[PDB]
Amino acid sequence: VNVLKGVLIECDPAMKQFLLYLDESNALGKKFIIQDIDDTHVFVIAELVNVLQERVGELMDQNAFS
Amino acid sequence: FTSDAKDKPIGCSVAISTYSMLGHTTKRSWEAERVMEWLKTQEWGLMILDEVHTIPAKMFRRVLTIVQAHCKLGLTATLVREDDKIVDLNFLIGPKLYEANWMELQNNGYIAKVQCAEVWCPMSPEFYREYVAIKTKKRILLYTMNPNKFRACQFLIKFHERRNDKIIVFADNVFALKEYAIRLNKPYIYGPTSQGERMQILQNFKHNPKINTIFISKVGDTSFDLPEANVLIQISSHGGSRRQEAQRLGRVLRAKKGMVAEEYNAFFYSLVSQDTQEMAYSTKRQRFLVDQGYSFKVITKLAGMEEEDLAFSTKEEQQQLLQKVLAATDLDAEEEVVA
Amino acid sequence: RGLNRVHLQCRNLQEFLGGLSPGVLDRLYGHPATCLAVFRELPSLAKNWVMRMLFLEQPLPQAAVALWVKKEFSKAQEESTGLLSGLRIWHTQLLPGGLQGLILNPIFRQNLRIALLGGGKAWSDDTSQLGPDKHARDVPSLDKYAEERWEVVLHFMVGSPSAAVSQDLAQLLSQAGLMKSTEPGEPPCITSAGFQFLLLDTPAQLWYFMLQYLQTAQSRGMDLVEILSFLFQLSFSTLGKDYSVEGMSDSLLNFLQHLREFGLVFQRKRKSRRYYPTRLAINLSSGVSGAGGTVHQPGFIVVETNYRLYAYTESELQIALIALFSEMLYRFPNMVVAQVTRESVQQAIASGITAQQIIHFLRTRAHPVMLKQTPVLPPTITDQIRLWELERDRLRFTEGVLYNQFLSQVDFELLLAHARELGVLVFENSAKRLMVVTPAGHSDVKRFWKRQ
Q1: Scanning every residue of chain A, which has its alpha carbon at the shortest distance from the alpha carbon of C428?
Q2: Where is the Helicase C-terminal domain (chain B)?
């Protein structure tokens, strides 16, 4: 009901919006944000954090360019 | 002797002229019949090239064929020419005569030690919404108008003003440079700025000690009669050629008299939004600078950036700025013309 | 990836012994050398007080002892006190009237005393009146042999050819978690911890490697206390002098064979009863290599402001290590040229290597010409090396259980109070009444949510 196991994710406000945008884009193939809890913390589905870390890192690199 | 202005072959002793006039394919005007036939007829004892490192083979070959001067001297900013490509046209002139070492100029103060630095500002969540959503080049304002970038810019300017360092602020966009200079209440120069209005600022900057900071449009990327300054800040690290940026940097920066014992007596800043397209040009500038031997550093926060009164300190003013940025058209957000 | 990257927890002597049983430590303190090893590792605070108190059997009052250090440093003295007591060195005894008197463990006392002055054993050392050994081994030959052996183990991690080691040692490298078992047959593979270990310095490397051996020692049936005491006696041994294997248990013989194969000791033959301890064994202590090129052997990496590395090294091992975090440019017979870059350093970072490992790795190997300056690594490099990890180490993961959307603020304040009561509170949002709790409280609070 009101209880979920998961991963608390600490991120800066910029990557808070990235996480929200990336979840909104469904860009891992699935929704991964459980909910936004603060400007610096988000609760996330543990299975997709494994993919999130890579795709965020690659997209952080890609965002550097062009 | 250049089609931009009236010219005087009669009794000339030093003809100072533009390659694109002389290396023409076909006459520009009756003024080309006046001057080019006259110039084809004269035998100049010496040819001085100020931008040979920028002239294409065809224009140089045409000029050399037309003038046939007794001596040629090529002046260059850097030995590697953007138009060198497959063939090094330098052999047309001759060997390299001399090369002033950066270290010899710095060790003797002829060229100041320039503090290269980049303010890697974290992207604002709201601007991050618009940054990823706006895939089009209207995105330029988002990295440019981040409050972190503005607040850091405001502080460092007021800091360099407290040091009474002559400082110039350059940006890639009309609205951005306008909004900055307007809110900062500092002089801004644009193409429409009449020469008297422009000279009022320039004279009060070049000679009057009151104006320590002035804002100059993207026109500064080229010959716009930029004044002398000791500090330069790029509001956008987004930009063109690294060499043209380095050329501009040296063109404006001058050693601050009596401060050569300090860590630096010249300073360069370029402001960067983290996780944005600016970071590559930032990285390539950073690399190109250390490759050219220039000292470099990165900045994120410094004393006063939060300890002082700086704009957009409230969510609403940040929102108004962001909405004014969003309400601005692509044209106001696009890259400012350079002319 | 629910938590942060796996880190090679470097546990010094305090962290290791701090978990041992007092009887084990008492047995360990049985030897004088074990006490000196422990004592020398203590901070100067404890080092002096222990020496000052060694000659007393009277329980000196806790306050008077604590009043030996100045007001501002007494706070830092608590660190040494907590250590000495936690390490069973200090045991409280009660003065008449119940006052907290302090006493050092008599075994430790007596062994340090037997260390300083004569005792029933002469440091447990002897020459056995034997003459110069057959096929005499020279000090430089011992060092090179120990080096070669250590290099072979590092080469084995690197997976280079000719890295000859026993499968039990290869197994241990995998058992300790250094060489990852990603593929059958254990082909060369390395974990983040193994890479961190590779970039770690020799003394801390050997130390932690031996700690893993000790962690498996009783799983391997070896004698922890005996091996430790033997190791401490070896650390207090001399390079040129000879030592005998006379009176060593088979557990020690097995370890000695490993110790020999590992190159820490040189033997005439595997069966020989006399040996020479190598420099590595004498230098095997929980200490620091230095902030620049190593005192024992100088550095060779000329790190330059333009991020260019000019490593005057021939060693394929050292070169391959540099290739992990830096992009290599040229190979020259006496020197190798490489450059540190975002991508190559992001390779190390993505492989799980803290930039401080690289900074320290380069520092410990910094060419001596780079010395004679306060910062051996230019600030720009140090800053950008760290900045590259600080670019992509902002996302920090943490497994927990979320409690949200309660029926009212009373539920939130009650659940938060319960989280505060149990200290299981991770984070909370009082505006939206959101709470994150450690996973241990999942069932306890989920069931309590039905009761409150």
Answers
A1: A37
A2: 151-311
Experimentally, how was this structure solved?
cryo-EM
Domain ranges of chain A: 3-64
Q: Residues near A49 by Cβ (< 8 Å), separated by ≥ 6?
A: A7, A9, A32, C1, C2, C397
Residue C166's SS3 state is coil
Question: Which phi and psi (to 5°) does residue C408 adopt?
Answer: -160, 180
| Residue C385 and residue B298 in contact, taking contact as beta carbons nearer than 8 Å | no
Is C350 in the A-facing interface, judged by CB distances under 8 Å? yes
Q: Distance from CA of residue C23 to its chain's centroid? A: 23
Q: Which of B173, B115, B155 is nearest to B307 (CA)?
A: B155
Asked if A16's CB is within 8 angstroms of B125's CB, the reply is yes
Report strand pairing: A41-44 vs A3-10.
Answer: antiparallel
DSSP assignments along C44-95, one per residue: HHHHHHHHHHTT--S-EEHHHHHTTS-HHHHHHHHHHHHHHHHTTSEEEEEE
A49 φ, ψ to 5°? Answer: -55, -35
Residue B269 has phi, psi (to 5 degrees) of -130, 145
Nearest by CB to C380, from B291, B293, B296: name it.
Answer: B296
Q: How far apart are CA B155 and CA C374, in angstroms?
A: 31
Cβ pairs A/B, distance under 8 A = 40
Residues in chain C with CB shorter than 8 Å from the CB of B283 are 342
Residues in CB range of B193: below 8 A, 6 or more apart: B201
Q: Is A18 in contact with B276 (Cβ distance < 8 A)?
A: no
Strand order, beta sheet including C301-303:
C301-303, C308-311, C336-340, C326-331
What residues contact B35, with CB distance under 8 A and at least 6 apart? Answer: B1, B7, B9, B21
The answer, for B124 touching chain A at a CB cutoff of 8 Å, is: yes
**Nearest chain B alpha carbon to A56:** B275
**Contact indicator for C60, C39 with CB cutoff of 8 Å:** no
Q: Shortest Cα distance from A50 to chain C (angstroms)?
A: 5
> Is the distance from CB of C377 to CB of C303 less than 8 angstroms?
yes
Residue of B100, B134, B127, B17 whose CA lies nearest to B66: B17
The arrangement of secondary structure in A3-64, i.e. its CATH architecture, is 2-Layer Sandwich (3.30)
A64: nearest CB among B122, B133, B277: B277
CA angle at C150 for the pair C149 and C152, rounded to the nearest 5°: 65
Chain B contact for A61, CB < 8 A?
Answer: no
Q: Is the dihedral of CA B233, B235, B238, B240 positive or negative?
A: negative
Angstrom resolution of this structure: 4.1
